[PDB]
């Protein structure tokens, strides 16, 4: 089988610069009738592939003029110039010409954007979940970048680790931002056993963490 | 304007096996190449096998190939890919496409991500999230959704029937003690909310269930 080597793994870049993803074949994958199979897809989270260029340079109908192909032999190169906000995702090389057929491994471009502080809002267990005997305290902090951010759950002023469950949505195909969901589990009586929670966001935007609380009783 | 129709999802047993279904409407179907193809997570995805409605014909990957069977209806249109033995190493999402001409795969299924367990499927609780009792109007409000403890994947989530997609995070399920949990967040502007309706709705295919949640004002 074909082993199709794609580089970087992590491709992180700037609105408007240039992206330049390589892939290199274990063996010549020209077909018979001369013509080399070589394919490059981009497929989002959630959604099936698309298939950007063809034929190692040709581009698929729709697809805009700055995405080209190029190479030969065992290395072949996607770039990507003026990169644009939707252009991220995961880009996947593929050669079509010996079966079975096979993709490479992967190569996620990151779009860089300007720094960005999160929206953040806390949520205190709702009335039908307490009814249940639980309590989950819910904090979104939303649309930041970079991705790296950290959050800190205090109960009554003292920090809480266990019982935190943290989410991550996608890079969003629009803003290039990120979210952040971080939910803190506990019964109910541990809930009623305390009165204010807190969610403490630490991102680079801020030397101060921006801090979210509320008091159980309170309104 | 071809479309190949898949199911979103589905669970199975291990030592079991399934049929996944793929429609290929819009015309030919006879003339192309369907194939199967495997992927797990994000990584590159694997080819299965392929076969050819027209005049009948297989070819499978050496990996799967006492493992899947490819079959065809012509009067409906559908290719079907067999699995057997499944084991949880065939939990993953599998996409059917076409290949024909100068390029392969140029369209393709929704893909049907599919859940080897022997768990036990649990419905989701869901919870409306409304903001802190009697904090501060902003010119935004963000509402909530939690849904706790389901099995197996997916739930699909909306908010308004579908209606209001914009202002929307949807967050990646995490499972923790055997149980996946999820939420959403919608920000609109105080004006929209509490003054207009706004409601969660969770559909959990598994369990068969759809649950509405509106969320108003502690
Ligand atoms: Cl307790």
């Known amino acids: 089988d074909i082993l199709m080597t794609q580089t970087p793994l992590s491709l992180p870049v700037s609105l408007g610069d240039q992206a330049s993803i390589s892939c290199r074949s274990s063996?010549?994958?020209?077909?018979?009738?001369?013509?080399?199979?070589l394919e490059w897809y981009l497929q989002r989270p959630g959604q099936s592939p698309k298939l950007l260029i063809y034929?190692?340079?040709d581009r698929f109908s729709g697809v805009p003029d700055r995405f080209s192909g190029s190479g030969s032999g065992t290395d072949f190169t996607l770039k990507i110039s003026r990169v644009e906000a939707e252009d991220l995702g995961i880009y996947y090389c593929f050669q079509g010409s010996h079966i079975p057929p096979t993709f490479g491994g992967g190569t996620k471009l990151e779009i860089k954007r300007a720094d960005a502080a999160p929206t953040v809002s806390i949520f205190p267990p709702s009335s039908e979940q307490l009814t249940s005997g639980g309590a989950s305290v819910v904090c979104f902090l939303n649309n930041f970048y970079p991705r790296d951010i950290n959050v800190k759950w205090k109960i009554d002023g003292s920090e809480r680790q266990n019982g935190v469950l943290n989410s991550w949505t996608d890079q969003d195909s629009k803003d290039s931002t990120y979210s952040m969901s971080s939910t803190l589990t506990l019964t109910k009586d541990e809930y009623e056993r305390h009165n204010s929670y807190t969610c403490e966001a630490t991102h680079k935007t801020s030397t101060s963490p921006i801090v979210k609380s509320f008091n159980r009783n309170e309104c | 304007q071809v479309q190949l129709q898949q199911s979103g999802s589905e669970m199975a047993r291990p030592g079991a096996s399934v049929k996944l279904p793929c429609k290929a409407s819009?015309?030919?179907?006879?003339?192309?190449?369907m194939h199967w193809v495997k992927q797990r997570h994000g990584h590159g995805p694997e080819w299965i096998g392929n076969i050819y409605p027209g005049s009948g014909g297989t070819n499978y990957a050496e990996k799967f190939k006492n493992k899947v069977t490819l079959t065809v209806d012509r009067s409906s249109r559908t290719v079907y890919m067999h699995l057997s033995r499944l084991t949880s190493e065939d939990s993953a999402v599998y996409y059917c496409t076409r290949s024909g001409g100068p390029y392969f795969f140029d369209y393709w299924g929704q893909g049907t991500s599919l859940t080897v367990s022997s768990a036990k499927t649990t419905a989701p609780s869901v919870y409306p999230l409304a903001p802190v009792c009697g904090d501060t109007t902003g010119s935004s409000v963000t509402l909530g959704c939690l849904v706790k403890g389901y099995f197996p994947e997916p739930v699909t989530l909306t908010w308004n029937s579908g209606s209001l997609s914009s202002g929307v995070h949807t967050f990646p399920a995490v499972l923790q003690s055997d149980l996946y949990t999820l939420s959403s967040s919608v920000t609109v502007t105080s004006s929209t909310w509490p003054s207009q309706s706004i409601t969660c709705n969770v559909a959990h295919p598994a369990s068969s269930t759809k649950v509405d949640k509106k969320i108003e004002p502690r």
């Open positions: 034929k190692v340079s």
């Open positions: 063996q010549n994958i020209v077909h018979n009738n001369g013509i080399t199979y």
């Open positions: 819009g015309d030919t179907f006879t003339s192309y190449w």
